[PDB]
């Protein structure tokens, strides 16, 4: 139960507040390792981990690390569902 649905113009500040990081590199993935390139359109630091509780560098692959920001790859450890709701952004020059 929620009453109204509001819509309006998105301020640059709103766009940045949504994004979990900037998409600097234009790369997509690696065509051999199937891993998403860092700071690319699929960066796991930004949008999320490919698999559940699995970070990019492979240091944290277990469920025990719930909410740890890996220090060697910068990926958070939650369910891959977040790759369906985390926004990115490009900062325009």
């Amino acid at each position: 139960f929620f009453d109204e649905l509001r819509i309006g113009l998105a301020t640059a500040e709103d766009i940045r507040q949504w994004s979990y990081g900037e998409v600097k590199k234009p790369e997509t993935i690696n065509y051999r390792t199937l891993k998403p390139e860092k700071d690319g359109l699929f960066c796991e630091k930004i949008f999320g981990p490919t698999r559940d509780w699995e970070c990019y560098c492979g240091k944290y692959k277990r469920v025990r690390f719930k909410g740890i920001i890996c220090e060697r790859c910068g990926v958070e450890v939650t369910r891959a569902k977040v790759r369906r709701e985390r926004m990115g952004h490009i900062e325009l020059a």
Binding site: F2, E4, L5, G8, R51, W53, V63, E85
Partner: protein, 1114 residues
């Protein structure tokens, strides 16, 4: 006698008119086209006898247009000639098996001419694997039989149009000069009485800009077009004047952003319309233009390009047409009428067949190679260059692959039954590249045109969204080398019909008057009646004196398609039901055993034979040894040829293609005779269905509006049983954690389900398999980090997961064949694949409740009840009927055919004997002597628009043979007395009883049933999948939602759009609550709406959900 040419069964025809020409090869459309493409000896002989001078094969044409190839200086040259073919790489069936493409290597002869050294090196160059056409007119791409459909495209030439303004209500006129290739040019007269020209879609320039660019003085322009005020006003309202001014004005509108040089524009304005490089009217285009303007009418077709003379005469034509003129003579040309063109008329609507469609793709590939050659020439040294170093055949093979694999015209062959394939090969499509888009096809392109007579069929056309866009070629129609569809006509000299047959195009036909086929003719040739029906230019039908007829039709059935001509008493069916009948004949399912129809039309024989799914003897001889596997023929000269039968082969559409020998050991057989027929064939005639005993009466509502009631006899004796073969396929690839292995050892699977598997995990041949059973046991290794916490616990409290090939829901049959390809065993598989298994399952489908039957008159229905043989209303002698058709769905549809068909049907089953004593009765005076006596189960023909007249049928019903007991069961009205098998009492009134040909259409409940509790969900939208094959759910569309809202079923609507669809947590809790017996929980939010929100955000729209207090909630 009917069809007395091959050695076929004597089917007797009610024909009153004689056939002066027998049907041509129904497959010539594809055959002649391809033979012209590759310049086979047969085609060159056909063109040599046709009077052609310097005929050119398609490949020869491409190589001559390309040759020679020079750089900008002209110091180097390369030329191609003489294309030839080595033997085919692999046989057809082997290609189908191994998923490769049927082709032959194409060799040419290329030579490099060096001008700075005066020496030439000429060698043979392999150009590529050239796809080859089967003998049945099909291609084979990656193991699938495809057909390349003939395309209806607008012919090249000059066309004039008279449009009507919406606002000023004045008549405007336009012109289009459409070339076979190059830039377009269209002139027009706007509503300000000024003439303009648009060059390659670009801005509308004044029509005098073009004349100024060409070096014509303004005074000479006023000299030519002075008789029109509109052209004077154009030259006055002109902006810039000067030969070098309008030239640059064109240059900066055609190629903007470039410095305008006088010569850089002088070069392209001559190249885009007068140099054969980037502009070319095919010989046909040049001829069409030469007629429309009336110039060069004597010159041989050698100029493949547009000329300034043409443009001047064209603008003259236009300007004269605008101001009401009706006649024009070009300076130095013949007089010509001034009119607009139809672009729907089959003299302006061209048909390009396989050959041409392929030549265009080859041309693209060749130009792409030509550019690479010109670059590679100025790179390598000028003494070690060979044709082998210059030629890069990559774009050519890529071009032919891109065509066959991806094209609206390369269509997956319709292979339900031989007639479907034949029609598919004789299709005329308007859609495709160069033609038009479906969104760009008005009610006018689709409706019948008076020029389709004898060329395209006005009946056979889909009734879906493609109606009118897809026709079938008329029976006697052929294609000329220019692309137009010619039809034959008999020349009438002096009111005398001649056996001289000449083929005419559309515009050629309009220049004469032709008589309808069924005109009364003298035994010498003179017309009986002075007035005769006649077709006249612009599709005008009227009577005309006998001394006016120039030609007449060849056969009555000249206008119809192959399928259409297979409808008995077609002349009594309405075009709608006739269309449905001709379209449903192509949906007939090949039955286990095939019976030819009692009532035919004559077309069945040649349809079957030309379809190519039968086996005809190439040369005469005797049968040395005949087996169910093969048939060997010992010719008279001494050679032997062995024809192998195709046994239980899977058609493209799961129907069973199975050929059986007809002849026996030591039988004399002539050349061209059918020695073995295939699906839907009987002694060489199309047997699309069965002859069923029909009673036309209502029966306890089980046949209520268009439903059908059948006798279980048809189940017991496999009368409507048909075979269907499904292909199942699985592979074993390399995975990230290892490699999938196909193994009988499957985790947590009993030895009882694995009982039917061999050591490999493959099912064994002959095993019956229900839906869900294992066919190929494949396990794939799953990683530990991919396990559910409950899954990991269940693993701890007790690494490969099951990926076996199971039988899909609704499938079941005997496993008849297996095919295994292993990368270990030489078998070339796609990279990353180690094994591949294909399992073939055959099901023997009896006729079921809900299966769809149909006749030849668009009379269709589904099986609503199959009664026991004793329940059926039975005839006087105890023989129960087979099928009960409701009466109410008969006189509404206007398909009187079946009625007639029914009556004659009975006549053919019992036979007849006309009273010969005291002379020939007055009704049968027109019948051939062969029809006055007939034995039971006799074969007959009702040729379309000829054949049995109602009077003769009445008589035949009067003289029907009695049964074995000496009793006549049907009355002269055609009705008989029936007994209710359920109560015994006879039915109060006489009922129409007869025999009708019914076909089993390919719409069976065994395929069309489906149901889903749960299953896959699309990842993005989280809504259930679609389609039975993906185990999907049905779509609750917008209209159905309106229905819900209408009823006010709020909770049902919510439940449909939430827990039953994309409520990620709600659907799970519903499943849990059902298995628990608890109540259904409260629906959550649809994930699809979350997706909507995220998308609206991706478009910089800040959408927020507010609570009743005003705080945004997440």
């Amino acid at each position: 006698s009917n069809n007395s040419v091959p050695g076929a069964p004597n089917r007797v025809s009610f024909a009153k008119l004689r056939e002066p020409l027998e049907v041509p090869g129904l497959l010539d459309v594809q055959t002649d086209s391809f033979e012209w493409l590759i310049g086979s000896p047969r085609w060159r002989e056909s063109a040599a006898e046709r009077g052609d001078v310097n005929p050119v094969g398609g490949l020869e044409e491409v190589l001559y247009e390309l040759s020679p190839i020079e750089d900008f200086s002209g110091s180097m040259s390369l030329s191609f000639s003489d294309p030839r073919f080595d033997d085919v790489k692999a046989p057809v069936d082997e290609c189908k098996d191994k998923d490769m493409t049927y082709a032959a290597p194409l060799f040419v002869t290329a030579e490099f001419i060096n001008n700075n050294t005066g020496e030439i090196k000429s060698q043979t160059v392999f150009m590529g694997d050239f796809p080859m056409m089967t003998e049945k007119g099909t291609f084979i791409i990656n193991g699938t039989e495809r057909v390349v459909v003939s395309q209806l495209v607008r012919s090249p030439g000059v066309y004039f149009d008279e449009t009507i303004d919406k606002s000023t209500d004045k008549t405007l006129h336009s012109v289009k000069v459409i070339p076979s290739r190059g830039a377009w040019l269209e002139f027009d007269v706007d509503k300000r009485d000024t003439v303009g020209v648009r060059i390659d879609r670009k801005r509308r320039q004044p029509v005098t800009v073009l004349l100024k660019a060409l070096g014509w003085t303004s005074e000479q322009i006023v000299e030519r077009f002075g008789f029109s005020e509109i052209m004077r006003s154009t030259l006055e309202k002109d902006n810039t004047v000067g030969t070098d001014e309008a030239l640059l004005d064109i240059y900066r509108k055609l190629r903007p952003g470039e410095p305008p040089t006088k010569e850089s524009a002088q070069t392209l304005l001559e190249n885009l319309f007068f140099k054969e490089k980037r502009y070319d009217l095919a010989r046909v285009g040049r001829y069409k233009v030469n007629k429309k303007l009336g110039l060069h009418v004597g010159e041989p077709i050698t100029s493949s390009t547009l000329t300034e003379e043409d443009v001047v005469a064209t603008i003259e034509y236009l300007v004269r047409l605008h101001e009401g003129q009706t006649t024009m003579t070009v300076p130095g040309g013949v007089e010509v009428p001034v009119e607009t063109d139809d672009i729907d008329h089959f003299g302006n609507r061209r048909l390009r067949t396989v050959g041409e469609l392929i030549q265009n793709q080859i041309r693209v590939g060749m130009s792409r190679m030509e550019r690479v050659v010109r670059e590679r020439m100025t790179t390598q040294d000028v003494e070690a260059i060979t044709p082998q170093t210059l030629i890069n055949i990559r774009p050519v093979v890529a071009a032919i692959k891109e065509f066959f694999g991806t094209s609206q015209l390369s269509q997956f062959m319709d292979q339900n039954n031989p007639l479907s394939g034949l029609t598919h090969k004789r299709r005329l499509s308007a859609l495709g590249p160069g033609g038009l888009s479906r969104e760009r096809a008005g009610l006018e392109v689709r409706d019948v045109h008076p020029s389709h007579y004898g060329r395209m069929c006005p009946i056979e056309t889909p009734e879906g969204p493609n109606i009118g866009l897809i026709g079938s070629l008329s029976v006697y129609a052929r294609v000329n080398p220019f692309g137009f569809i010619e039809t034959p006509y008999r020349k009438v000299v002096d009111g005398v019909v001649s056996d001289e047959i000449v083929y005419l195009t559309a515009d050629e036909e309009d220049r004469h008057v032709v008589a309808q086929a069924n005109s009364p003719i003298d035994a010498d040739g003179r017309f009986v009646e002075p007035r005769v029906l006649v077709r006249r230019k612009a599709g005008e039908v009227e009577y005309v004196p006998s001394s006016e007829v120039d030609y007449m039709d060849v056969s009555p059935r000249q206008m119809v398609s192959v399928a259409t001509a297979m409808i008995p008493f077609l002349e009594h069916d309405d075009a709608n039901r006739a269309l449905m009948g001709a379209n449903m004949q192509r949906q007939a399912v090949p039955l286990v055993r095939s019976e030819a129809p009692l009532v035919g039309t004559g077309m069945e024989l040649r349809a079957a034979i030309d379809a190519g799914d039968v086996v005809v003897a190439e040369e005469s001889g005797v049968i040395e040894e005949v087996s169910a596997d093969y048939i060997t023929v010992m010719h008279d000269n001494g050679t032997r040829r062995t024809y192998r039968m195709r046994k239980f082969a899977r058609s493209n559409h799961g129907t069973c293609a199975n050929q059986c020998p007809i002849v026996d050991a030591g039988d004399r057989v002539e050349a061209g005779q059918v020695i073995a027929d295939g699906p839907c064939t009987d002694d060489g005639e199309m047997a699309l269905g069965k002859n069923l005993l029909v009673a036309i009466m209502p029966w306890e509502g089980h046949n209520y509006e268009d439903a059908i009631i059948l006798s279980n006899r048809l189940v017991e004796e496999d009368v409507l049983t048909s075979i269907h073969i499904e292909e199942h396929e699985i592979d074993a690839r390399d995975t990230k954690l290892g490699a999938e292995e196909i193994t009988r050892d499957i985790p947590n699977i009993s030895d009882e389900v694995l009982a039917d598997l061999d050591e490999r995990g493959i099912v064994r041949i002959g095993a019956e398999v229900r839906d869900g059973d294992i066919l190929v046991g494949k396990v794939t290794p799953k990683g530990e980090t991919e396990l559910t916490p409950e899954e990991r616990l269940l693993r701890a409290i007790f690494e490969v997961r099951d990926t076996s090939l199971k039988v899909p829901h609704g499938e079941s049959g005997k496993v008849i064949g297996i095919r295994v390809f292993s990368r270990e065993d030489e078998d070339e598989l796609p990279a990353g694949v180690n094994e591949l298994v294909r399992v073939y399952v055959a099901q023997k489908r009896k006729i079921s409740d809900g299966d769809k039957l149909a006749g030849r008159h668009g009379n269709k229905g589904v099986i609503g009840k199959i009664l026991p043989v004793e329940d059926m209303p039975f005839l006087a002698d105890g023989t129960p009927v087979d099928i009960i058709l409701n009466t109410h769905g008969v006189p509404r549809r206007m398909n009187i055919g079946q009625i007639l068909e029914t009556h004659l049907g009975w006549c053919a089953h019992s036979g007849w004997k006309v009273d010969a004593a005291k002379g020939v009765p007055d009704w049968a005076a027109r019948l051939p002597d062969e029809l006055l006596e007939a034995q039971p189960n006799a074969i007959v023909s009702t040729p379309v628009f000829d054949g049995a007249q109602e009077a003769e049928l009445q008589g035949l019903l009067s003289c029907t043979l009695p049964n074995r007991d000496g009793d006549v069961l049907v009355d002269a009205d055609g009705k008989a007395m029936l007994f209710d098998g359920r109560s015994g009492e006879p039915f109060p009134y006489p009922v129409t009883v007869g025999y009708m040909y019914i076909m089993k259409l390919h719409h069976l409940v065994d395929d069309k049933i489906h149901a889903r509790s749960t299953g896959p969900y699309s990842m993005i939208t989280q809504q259930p999948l679609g389609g039975k094959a993906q185990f999907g759910g049905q779509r609750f569309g917008e209209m159905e939602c309106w229905a819900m809202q209408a009823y006010g079923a709020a909770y049902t609507l919510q439940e449909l759009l939430t827990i039953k669809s994309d409520d990620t947590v709600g659907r799970v809790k519903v499943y849990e609550a059902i298995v628990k017996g608890e109540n259904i929980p409260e629906p959550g939010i649809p994930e699809s709406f979350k997706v909507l929100l995220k998308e609206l955000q991706s478009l910089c729209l800040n959408v927020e959900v507010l609570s009743s207090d005003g705080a945004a909630i997440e």
